[PDB]
Ligand binder design. Structure first.
Ligand SMILES: [K+]
Ligand SMILES: [K+]
Ligand SMILES: [Mg+2]
Ligand SMILES: [Mg+2]
Ligand SMILES: [Mg+2]
Ligand SMILES: [Mg+2]
Ligand SMILES: [Mg+2]
Ligand SMILES: [Mg+2]
Ligand SMILES: [Mg+2]
Ligand code: NA
Ligand code: NA
Ligand SMILES: [Zn+2]
Lengths: 151, 48, 178, 169
RNA sequence: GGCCAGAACCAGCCCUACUGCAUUAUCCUGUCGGGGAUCAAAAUCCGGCGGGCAACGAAGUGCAAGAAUCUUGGGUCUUGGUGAAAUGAGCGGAGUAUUUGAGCUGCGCACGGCGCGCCGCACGCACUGGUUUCUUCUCCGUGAUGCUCCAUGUUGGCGA
RNA sequence: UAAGCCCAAUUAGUGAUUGCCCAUUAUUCCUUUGGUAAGGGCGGAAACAAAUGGAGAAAGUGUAGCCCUUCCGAUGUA
RNA sequence: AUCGAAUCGCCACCUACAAGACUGGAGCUUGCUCCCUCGAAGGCGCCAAGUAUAUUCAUGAUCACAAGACA
């Protein structure tokens, strides 16, 4: 029913729902657990901000194919997630030719989102255990059979 | 032999059902040459 | 495993004509892997006994007789097999099984192993469940004892297929290579 | 001693669709087959099992060959074979295997921290005991070296070297 | 960028997950008797009689047409594309209807059992019968005034 | 406790009738080539300069084949 | 010192032995009963030296040999 050209159209699988906890399978933060916040419009990539305080993962977009969305979720209806738009990750063109540099607006968005995400985790009955879950690092051990596991 | 198709044995994968789970997954063979040649993020990440 | 031979009843007759306005109807019991083989055996028996060919006959029915409830029984199987050296040899054997099809399938396996007789040279004359007191072979009657008990010795227990391993530590269950 | 295949013997199914289920021998067909049934299990109606696929347990209920379903159920409930089996370690191991098989990533994390917590506290208790009664390699090595070291250090020259090079520090 | 790579969708194919009709009687039960074997039973086994659905994850028995749309399966580095004529149950509009099947039943005729028309009819044929109790989506829509070929995405890497 | 011989199965008394591996074979897709080949188009429709949508369009056995669509065959000594 | 490399689980609890017609231990009734540590785990390691009051992680911008690797 929804138009395929609309920003609201999506095909994302159900497991990668907002609030779910995802395992990062690739990139700089491989093996880290993170929290799925939203999907960018036009069937875009997911946006994960598994709190940087817990594991160092900032507000970053990631393709859903490079993540394992576990069945363990967190109610994040209290998180706004509205200011996280496609414009946040856009970058100006570079013309023809040590603490990390983060723009002030990006820093404020990270501050507000993480604070609300942490508060929602605290509100959870298993929040302290889930906070430790977010700190845990996933790795493939000798003898592991990931193809046989439930997630 | 037909070299266009490779056969890979993966540890802890001993059933056909187990191998079905890995269909479509990315596979990488790592080796080294003699000289340092161009790679991904050659300019962005010189440490690579 | 479930038996490889199914119990078939084939009802057929010679096609009606002017010389035989109401041909006799014949009923046949056969243990065949499928109904096509069952009909083939029926028409062979009609040709050799009643002088009726398949090209001049009708198959009224060809249906499987279901097995009864699985009960440890003794089956008397009257069977015969052909060989070039000895012609037709007929024997009456007893088997321990839970069904007619299992007992007949066991008899066919026994004939193949101990006499090199294939399916198409074997004729099953009869098969029926018999009481304990009518069993003559001690190898069969030894299972009629009210207190039959024995250990399980010299058994090769293979692990489940998912957990099977190539190299395992000597006195542990840890799979080094699996 | 090994448990015999007899009428009433309780068995566990080793492999197949009924893997790790319990039944009663009920009847013996031949040297290779039996007729297993368990009223309390949903999938364990009376069926034929090969003797290579069954593990004879230690419990035997008092039934006759080819007994009725009611007679088997009464004998099983009276003998308390299933209740007695549930308390053993093998039954707990079988149940724990299913828990691991259906576990999620969160449950795997919970087991990992629980095992590590036990591992940490085992190290604490071992250290407390090993300080008093030396059993580890380093404490044993220290306890053997201590007597000779004290004799080697109780000399005037040892005192001078110790004091001079310590006050220098 | 006419290079490398990853995700998206579109069409076509290629693999699958989801199953209904018929059949079952040498069968299933209860009971009496026999027969059996026990310390005593029970069971295997044979008859008479009374009931029947071993029952849809009963049977490994015959045939299966179950719209990957509802309910977002996998693959396509084994195809071509990013809308340069998207013929779609899939795209666009319009309306809560349409008639497929299943149940339940009217008349006639066929069909089966009994010897003239009587009984039955599993529900066959015609009335495109009726009841809508359950189950469905339904209808309409774009010629080339394009003879032919080529030319229209997204995200990074590399290239200033 | 065959990796031998005879028989019988396809993950097994559970609930149905395709275990797996190898062809210059089969099906299907792309390309070439040749047909006893099958069809369509070929009376330039209109409009459109550069600075800043394009190009072609041959009445044809055979060419860089007039163009397009479609179907079938394709090895081979003398 | 060329030299950039492929390898990706550590241990001072496995790293001793032997038997699968049967080695946790008894009884006699010899296949059953009873006792036990109940006969189906080598220990750790997988991100707070431990299960809590925590804590710097980004701009390496969405995959790319882990851009590091003395556990
Ligand atoms: K041609
Ligand atoms: K010409
Ligand atoms: Mg012992
Ligand atoms: Mg369907
Ligand atoms: Mg529509
Ligand atoms: Mg293009
Ligand atoms: Mg099966
Ligand atoms: Mg030629
Ligand atoms: Mg590297
Ligand atoms: Na070819
Ligand atoms: Na061709
Ligand atoms: Zn017993």
């Amino acid at each position: 029913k929804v138009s395929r050209k609309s920003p609201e159209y999506t095909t994302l699988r159900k497991s990668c729902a907002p609030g779910a906890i995802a395992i990062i399978l690739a990139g700089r933060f491989r093996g880290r657990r993170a929290v799925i916040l939203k999907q960018l419009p036009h069937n875009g990539p997911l946006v994960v901000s598994g709190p940087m305080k817990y594991n160092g993962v900032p507000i970053r977009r990631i393709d859903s194919r490079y993540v394992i969305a576990t069945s363990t979720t967190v109610d994040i209806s209290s998180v706004d997630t509205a200011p996280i738009t496609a414009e946040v990750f856009q970058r100006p063109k570079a013309e023809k030719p040590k603490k990390t540099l983060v723009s002030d607006a990006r820093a404020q968005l990270q501050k507000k989102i993480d604070a609300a995400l942490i508060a929602a985790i605290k509100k959870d009955a298993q929040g302290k255990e889930k906070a430790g879950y977010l700190r845990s690092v996933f790795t493939v051990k000798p003898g592991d059979a990931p193809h046989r596991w439930n997630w | 032999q037909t070299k266009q198709t490779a056969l890979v044995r993966v540890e802890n994968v001993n059933t056909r059902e187990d191998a079905t789970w890995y269909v479509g997954k990315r596979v990488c063979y790592v080796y080294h040459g003699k000289k340092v040649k161009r790679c991904v993020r050659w300019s962005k990440a010189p440490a690579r | 495993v479930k038996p490889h031979l199914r119990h078939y009843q084939v009802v057929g007759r010679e096609s009606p004509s002017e010389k035989n306005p109401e041909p006799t109807v014949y009923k046949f019991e056969v243990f065949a892997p499928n109904f096509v083989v069952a009909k083939s055996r029926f028409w062979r028996m009609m040709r050799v006994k009643n002088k009726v060919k398949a090209t001049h006959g009708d198959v009224l029915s060809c249906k499987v007789v279901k097995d009864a409830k699985l009960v440890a029984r003794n089956y008397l199987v009257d069977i015969a097999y052909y060989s070039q050296r000895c012609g037709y040899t007929r024997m009456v054997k007893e088997f321990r099984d839970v069904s007619k099809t299992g007992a007949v399938s066991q008899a066919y396996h026994d004939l193949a192993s101990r006499h090199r007789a294939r399916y198409h040279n074997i004729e099953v004359l009869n098969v029926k469940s018999i009481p304990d007191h009518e069993v003559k072979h001690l190898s069969i009657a030894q299972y009629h004892a009210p207190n039959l008990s024995f250990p399980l010795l010299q058994r090769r227990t293979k692990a489940t297929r998912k957990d099977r391993a190539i190299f395992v530590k000597k006195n542990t269950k840890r799979a080094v290579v699996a | 001693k090994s448990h015999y295949i007899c009428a009433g013997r309780l068995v566990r199914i080793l492999r197949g669709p009924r893997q790790d289920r319990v039944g009663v021998i009920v009847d013996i067909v031949d040297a290779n087959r039996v007729l297993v049934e368990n009223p309390e299990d949903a999938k364990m109606w009376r069926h034929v099992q090969n003797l290579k696929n069954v593990e004879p347990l230690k419990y035997c209920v008092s039934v006759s060959r080819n007994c009725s379903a009611k007679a088997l159920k009464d004998a099983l409930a009276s003998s308390k074979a299933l209740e007695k089996y549930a308390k053993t370690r093998t039954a707990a191991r079988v149940e724990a295997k299913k828990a691991c098989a259906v576990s999620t990533d969160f449950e795997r994390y919970q087991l990992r921290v629980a095992r590590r917590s036990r591992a940490h506290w085992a190290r604490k208790v071992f250290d407390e005991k090993d300080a008093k009664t030396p059993v580890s390699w380093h404490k044993v090595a220290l306890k053997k070296m201590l007597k000779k070291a004290a004799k080697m250090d109780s000399t005037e020259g040892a005192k001078r070297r110790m004091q001079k090079a310590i006050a220098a520090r």
